[PDB]
Amino acid sequence: IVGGYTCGANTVPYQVSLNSGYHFCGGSLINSQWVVSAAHCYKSGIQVRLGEDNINVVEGNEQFISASKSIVHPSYNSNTLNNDIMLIKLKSAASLNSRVASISLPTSCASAGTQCLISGWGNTKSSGTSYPDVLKCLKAPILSDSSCKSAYPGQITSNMFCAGYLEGGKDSCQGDSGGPVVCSGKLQGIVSWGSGCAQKNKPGVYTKVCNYVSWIKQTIASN
Ligand SMILES: [Ca+2]
Known about the structure:
The chain is mainly beta. Helices cover 7% and strands 32% of the residues. It folds into 2 domains: 1-12 and 103-210, Trypsin-like serine proteases (Thrombin, subunit H, Beta Barrel), CATH 2.40.10.10; 13-102 and 211-223, Trypsin-like serine proteases (Thrombin, subunit H), CATH 2.40.10.10. It has helices spanning 145-151, 213-221, and strands at 5-6, 15-19, 23-31, 34-37, 47-50, 63-72, 86-90, 115-120, 136-141, 160-163, 180-183, 186-193, 204-208. The strands form 2 sheets. Strands 1-9-8-11-12-13-10 form a 7-stranded antiparallel beta sheet. A 6-stranded antiparallel beta barrel has the order 2-3-4-7-6-5. The site of calcium ion has 8 residues, from loops. Calcium ion binds next to loops. Its EC number is 3.4.21.4.
């Protein structure tokens, strides 16, 4: 997160850290046994870390659970990043509480202007690298489709939306990938891609979760 703020320990209870000996992506807990992340975060040997604040220190509240299955969307395209969504089934159910809780799936898509909270342990620098120990937060609005497509002509599909600031200075960045974009208590987006980070006129692009609710539900029901 570039230009964001320190969330506060356990203030984003649905936020998970995907770990493989180091933090490589974020995710969202949608129930006691399932996490939603980005398809581009896929890899074997994923350990899901819940209840985390400082990812480099054991402080209490953490629950480390191995991924049982990682289900990348069947139509995911790695070149266009279309359908950049993945479900991860936990080997065992997480212990839900005040520090570890699931986020609701939306029943309808969010409109331009809606303010959302984006969080993650990704790079905090637009130019260079600087990874935080603790979770960073950023409130950003969903942009109009017209502004999104004019920023990335020919690259925005119906399963993507832009959120952020055209002036630059505030944006999600690498490391935040797979993480949540929550608006009004509902998971509306997943950190997907963009050009650089917090660059002027190059806002972040996110996976439009409302287009996948039926898929998520049907997949979870059959697994
Ligand atoms: Ca920790």
